[PDB]
Amino acid sequence: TTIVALKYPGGVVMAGDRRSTQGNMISGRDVRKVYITDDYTATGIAGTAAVAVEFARLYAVELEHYEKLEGVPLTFAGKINRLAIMVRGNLAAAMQGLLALPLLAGYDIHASDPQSAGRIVSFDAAGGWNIEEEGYQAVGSGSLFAKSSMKKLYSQVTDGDSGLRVAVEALYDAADDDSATGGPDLVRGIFPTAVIIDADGAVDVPESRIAELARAIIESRS
Template identity: 30%
Template sequence: MHTPAALSGNGPTDFPGILRHHGLAPQPPAHTPVTGHHSPVTPTHATTILAFKFADGVLVAGDRRATAGNVIMYDRADKVLEIDRHSLMAIAGVPATAWEMARVLEHSFHFFRRTQLAEMSLEGKVRALSKLLRDNLGLVLQGVGVVVPIFATFDTAAGIPRVYFYDPMGAQFEAADFAATGSGSPAVRAVLHHENTYARKPLRKLKAPEAVLLALRALDTAAESDSATGGVDRRARVFPIVKLITRKGIETLPESKLARLYKANLAD
């Protein structure tokens, strides 16, 4: 048991700093010496996650498959994690690291609100994730902890949805319309780009059911060529996780609704 940092009056005031003070920090800091050979980072973030803006906000979806090499470990993984009332983090990469990051992030936002008596700014939240990714660089270089997340949120101050994606070192990019990462992302990006550019209406004009259907189709298309992406498994009734963030908050689509929507729109 460590003496609380707050009692001494000159300890750390941010949550990751508090975790380090208590010896609870999950990741080694970035300057930990890297052992072994410097293998090039192989992009084995085997999964597919996507986010795009639609008429009422932003949709975030992820397939359910977790793999280790060519073995399917689990077909019901949840890769879209709720961080606060208006924010979701979707993860592609090593689950152990990613879930730990989501936990740190969720606690950091709560901790900030409780101690500072104000909600953390959007930029602060986006950068908090960036910082976690940078701190994780040691594991990335050892080839065991690559995480490539998407962060989606509804900017309640500006009244608009926002989507950010990251590289494994923590650089953040704001997506104009959509983002996709993971091994199945080339296919998803092709589908979303095609829809956004050549379909009857761009992504940001889609209504909620249309957006959900598109997400299912895009993930299933990715699964067609990528063995590490689960897609839609109608026989086992396993559907991707689909969540919507609107001004009102986060809505998770139930499986029954996804099944109905998907089935009604299959080609004859």
């Protein structure tokens, strides 16, 4: 599994691969690992499928629950804390092999400077969180490959579209070196999913745009 997130001027993009495995076997080819959790945030999760799906679903419910009860959404810091507490609550199960780690991406409507209101937050098994300030982050078995790729490509990110291209290429590099991360599948037409978030909110990136970028990366390396 590989999920990446990176900041670009004015927003953030998060993208994830589509593979699920059971040992060496490829058990799924179209899993969606990145979720829009509220109007300004997306969550991508790696590790145990059952736990990750429940995290995303319960977390979205918790954010909207607060909003309906209090009349206003939680501050971005509050959203981070809720996700951290949820991860911490899974610690016992996680030590038993039910371990899932989320990656959070968001746009802070209350930030002073809009061009940099993008946020990326990572989490560890005990609920520790870290607001990433180097521009990008990744989780999953292919994360080191993705991060080393983004380290070299990040200077090319100047807007949402180039941010999306770098994210897709980082997932491409993860799949190239990690057998547990799925590459673009041209035969079946299945590609990584992505979510872009800017001042207008979080939106799913249409598959056709990703397919286009993936084909260009492949052409380029051929």
